[model samples]
Structures are given as C-alpha cells and as structure tokens.
Target: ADQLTEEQIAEFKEAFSLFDKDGDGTITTKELGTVMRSLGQNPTEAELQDMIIEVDADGNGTIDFPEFLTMMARKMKDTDSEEEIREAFRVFDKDGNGYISAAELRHVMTNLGEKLTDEEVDEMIREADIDGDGQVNYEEFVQMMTAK
Candidate 1:
C-alpha cells in the first residue's frame, strides 16, 4: 500500500505490456522468462516458477496487472528509505570511484547472471550521469532509480 503516482502506474503498465506475451492479459512464468531473456538473462524453469509464485496473486500461476502493481507497490514501500538507497548505491559503486563506470555496471549485472550490451550499458550511464559527468555518483545513482 505504498503511494503510486499516475506516472509510475503508467510506467508499470507499459512494462507489463512488454512482458505479457501471447496477449493473454496475464504474464505466465514462460512469458516472464522470455521477457528476462530478451533483456539478456536466461532464468531456469525453476527460477521462473519461483519468481512467479513470489509475485503472482490469487495463486493463479500467472501475474496479472494488479498483481504486478502490488509487487511494485511493496517494493516502493520497502525501499523508500534513503539509507537503504545509499547503501545500495555504495554496493554498486565498486572500486569506490564516486561514480559507476560501464565495467562496474556490467560487473554488477553479471553478478546477477545478467548480461547487458555495451550500448545498453552506455545508455544507462548517460541516463544516470547527472551533471553530464561521465559516471554516476551515489546521489545520481539513487536519483536514477527513484526519480520519475
């Protein structure tokens, strides 16, 4: 039951649309796997099932828009604290460069068994690099994840 702005709701809806394969108005484990794969991560079938079970409401074995929204709301509520955000940024800024480089970003992603193309990595750095700096400082990183 966290606050969700209209814009956040809209972004959630758009993200859901991208993953709701088969146009069934719901996202199954298979569909979620496909979505993750498209983003460069291939989760195992068991992993997919676990993820669905964690987020899916109504025990329906699939995630609907409302269920997904609920999950996002929970995330927003849990991560609203600034201390938590700062800690997360510190963890990601490996090497303590006061900024996150492309290699650091890739390393973080790889730790989660995900892969991002160089272009994608560059785009993320650009988007988060406030002040037009070549990297993302802790404040910039927090803003990037939490800002609209």
Candidate 2:
C-alpha cells in the first residue's frame, strides 16, 4: 500500500471532494470531465471513461476517494523520481552544458573521492552514450542510472 503522509492525504481528500460534484463521496466520469474542462482540457468521453476504468478497482465505473488517492500518489512518485534523475544528471554536467563530457565525469568522480582512470571513465561514457556522441545527455544518463 502507498503510504501518504497525513498532509498529503488531507490534500487529496479536498481534491476528491471538489470532484465529487454532488458531495456523494464518489466521482462519476461526468464529474471528471467537468474537472478536466475547468483545467483547460477537453477530454473526450472515451478518455474520461478510460481514466475511471484505470483506477476503478471495484468496477464501479467511478472514482472513490481511495482510487483517486492511489492514482495521485503513483503519479506523484513518478514525477518525483524523474526530478531526482534530472537533478543527479546536473551534478556531472559541471559547465551547465546539456551533456556530461568524459572530462566532466572524471572531474566529478575525482572530487567525490573516487579515483577514476581515463579508461574507466571512457568505458562508462561509451556504455552510456547510445548515440555515440562521446558524452552523456539527459536520456542516456537516466537510462544508465536507472537501468538494471
């Protein structure tokens, strides 16, 4: 089970109540459409239905508070992980350049008390630089960091 803090749960509850148009403790697909429209998205009926079906574990064709909270927490965690990945990538891109050159990687590793030989640094770069760019971009860095 996802463990959301009390503050997070309370915020989700408020958002759930806002979408429960009739204060009925559940949100119908129509209500979901209404919220989307207010947020400037005109979701087609099929899209709205699909959204509910994805989280409607009880097969109710609607969103209960728990279902909404689960979806929200899952999405929140996904975004958090991506932000962390991007932040980590920045640490190796010392000159604010978009990519991490072998020199930069070596500098960072040496500063962190890791003595990386040129061959080791080149090996790491060659493995991660899928496009053969001789440097690691955001996508390559993320793949290298998260790959099993």
Candidate 3:
C-alpha cells in the first residue's frame, strides 16, 4: 500500500502540513485528533493512541509524514460512499424531509457553532442547491461536500 504517486504524495504532504501547522515535522496527539475530527472520524482518545502509538515506528509518541502518509493512503482506499454523507445530511435535514431547506440549514449551522448569519446561510444554500428551489437535496449536498 506504500505505492503512492508523486502527486498523491505531494497532496498528502499538503494535508499533513495542515495538521503539522507548527511545521515541527511531526503531528502530536492533539493535532492528530483535530485532523480526525475535522474529517468526521470522531476518534476516541484510546483510538487516537492506537493510531499514533501503534504506527509510530520511531516511538516518538507522534506521527511523522511517513506514518501519516501510510494512514492517509489506507483511509483513502476506504473513502466514503455517501453513507457518511447521508448521516451528515440528516443533521441538516432536521425534519427528515430529505431536503435541507434554508431554515433547516440555518438552524443546524447555528447550533453547531458555525456562527453564520442569515445572509451567509442563504449564500451557502445558493451554492449547493443546484435545483435552485431554495433547498439542497442529497445529490447537491454530496456534490458540495465532495467538490472541495
């Protein structure tokens, strides 16, 4: 599984740099946790320990670029199939209506501490609601999340 291309390695380095913001050449436990949560992994403390400690070949109690790349490649192979996206979509579709109306989008964003204003929320809807009916369906939601 270590057969990654140069471009893929470059991308992984960019991604790893995001967590290794201090540029100390290693991602500490907290930074790894931040990365995991941001990617919707929601890993527990013990799991994070396993992630770092188990793969931590150097036994430095942190993850370096090589270890990070290994994990990223493996995880990419198991990338989401919209099932996880559906779970996230459901969070915004509060009424189970299968569509994220402007109101629902606002409600979820506000409660999730996103602190977006009404105008900003509307802007987000416009960006994702491809059908342009003032709401976002599952397909649009998936596209929006994936297009990043």
lDDT, candidate 2, 94-117, per-residue tens:
665566766666565676576667
The backbone clash count of each candidate, in order, is 0, 0, 0
- Candidate 2 lDDT at 53 equals 66
Candidate 2: regions farther than 4 A off: 1-5, 33-49, 56-61, 78-84, 88-148
CA lDDT of each prediction against the hidden true structure: 0.61, 0.62, 0.64
Least well predicted 10-residue stretch by lDDT in candidate 1: 34-43
lDDT of 3 at 105: 62
Q: What CA root-mean-square deviation does each model show from the true structure?
A: 11.0, 10.5, 11.6
| lDDT measured at residue 70 in model 3 versus the true structure, 0 to 100 | 69
Task: Say which prediction, candidate 1 or candidate 2, comes out ahead on lDDT.
Answer: 2
Highest-scoring model, lDDT: 3
For model 2, give the 10-residue run with minimal summed lDDT.
34-43
Clashing pairs in 3: none
Superposed by TM-score, candidate 1 places the C-alpha of residue 83 at a distance from the truth, in angstroms, of 3.4
lDDT of 3 by residue, 31-86 (tens): 77776565434566876777765676466667777666667666556446655755
| Candidate with maximal TM-score | 1
